[PDB]
Amino acid sequence: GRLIYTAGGYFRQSLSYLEAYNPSDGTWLRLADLQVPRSGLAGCVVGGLLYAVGGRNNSPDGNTDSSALDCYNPMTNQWSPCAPMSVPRNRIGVGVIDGHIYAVGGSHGCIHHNSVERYEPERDEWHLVAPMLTRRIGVGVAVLNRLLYAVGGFDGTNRLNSAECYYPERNEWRMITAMNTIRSGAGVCVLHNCIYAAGGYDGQDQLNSVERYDVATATWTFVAPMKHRRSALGITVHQGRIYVLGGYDGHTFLDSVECYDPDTDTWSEVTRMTSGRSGVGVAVT
Ligand SMILES: CNC(=O)CCC(=O)N1CCC[C@H]1C(=O)N[C@@H]1COC(=O)c2ccccc2CSC[C@H](C(=O)N(C)C)NC1=O
Numbered sequence: 001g002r003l004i005y006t007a008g009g010y011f012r013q014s015l016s017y018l019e020a021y022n023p024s025d026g027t028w029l030r031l032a033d034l035q036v037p038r039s040g041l042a043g044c045v046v047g048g049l050l051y052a053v054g055g056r057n058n059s060p061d062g063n064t065d066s067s068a069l070d071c072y073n074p075m076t077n078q079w080s081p082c083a084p085m086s087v088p089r090n091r092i093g094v095g096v097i098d099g100h101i102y103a104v105g106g107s108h109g110c111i112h113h114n115s116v117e118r119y120e121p122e123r124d125e126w127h128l129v130a131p132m133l134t135r136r137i138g139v140g141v142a143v144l145n146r147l148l149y150a151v152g153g154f155d156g157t158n159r160l161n162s163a164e165c166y167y168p169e170r171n172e173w174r175m176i177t178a179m180n181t182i183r184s185g186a187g188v189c190v191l192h193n194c195i196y197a198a199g200g201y202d203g204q205d206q207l208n209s210v211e212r213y214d215v216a217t218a219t220w221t222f223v224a225p226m227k228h229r230r231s232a233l234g235i236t237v238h239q240g241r242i243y244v245l246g247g248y249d250g251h252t253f254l255d256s257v258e259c260y261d262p263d264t265d266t267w268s269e270v271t272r273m274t275s276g277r278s279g280v281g282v283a284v285t
């Protein structure tokens with residue numbers, strides 16, 4: 001029995017919540033709080049351990065971009081600090097290839113990173129890899145065919161509809177087909193050999209449209225939209241279905257959790273988080 005972990009987020013200030021949803025019995029677990037509150041972070045799982053990467057701590061008295069890597073063990077219910085990244089990355093994208101964590105883009109105050117770095121859990125070390133062709137904050141990352149895809153984001157001047165691809169063996173980035181929609185703060189994931197980009201911000205509105213990349217035909221195609229417009233949403237795949245958690249719709253911080261069935265091309269409300277929040281980090285273990 002695997003669970004959907006939600007870490008951090010934002011509601012009036014950055015949050016410390018770590019909670020797990022069981023899609024089988026519909027229950028939520030309140031787990032050990034993050035040591036430092038964070039929003040705009042990303043979550044991932046390497047060998048049964050959950051990792052919270054980057055983000056920023058917004059508080060009513062000051063804000064602090066994070067370069068932290070923290071590790072939660074479900075067996076112990078304890079967060080342990082890991083080696084920090086070379087630079088702070090708020091609105092980060094994360095991907096795992098061969099049990100290695102790739103920290104993609106993000107911001108550090110005025111800087112919009114195009115730099116990418118890789119964590120080796122076995123050595124507790126980060127090393128920079130080839131940078132992206134474009135600076136991307138609010139970037140969606142997906143691992144497909146042992147390639148690391150950086151999808152959309154914001155380069156400090158424009159919200160991007162562009163997407164690029166990283167070849168770990170070759171240490172290089174190549175531009176792929178751009179999305180039909182400009183999206184910064186989308187939920188990006190892989191389901192049945194397809195990259196799905198759900199929600200986001202086109203620079204005007206928060207989106208509810210969902211589109212998928214088919215590698216064979218190198219084309220992005222729209223699928224059923226979500227019931228709620230959402231940017232800074234959390235996303236994961238669990239038992240052949242996509243789950244989208246919370247987000248921001250232009251005025252409200254959503255508690256809404258939606259599920260996509262690829263077989264029926266329908267979205268349905270599955271549960272509500274214990275409280276509305278945006279900019280969460282999500283993973284399944
Ligand atoms: C459109 N305005 C922007 O971008 C910058 C302005 C902004 O919204 N700000 C400035 C300091 C606080 C921050 C904020 O309020 N962030 C929170 C937390 O977001 C995140 O983790 C996050 C994570 C990934 C991608 C993008 C985001 C931000 S989503 C935008 C949403 C928002 O529009 N409002 C006004 C509450 N914000 C928030 O949900």
Ligand SMILES: [Cl-]
Pocket residue numbers: 039040056090
């Ligand atoms: Cl933010």
Ligand code: NA
Pocket residue numbers: 165176215
């Ligand atoms: Na490709």
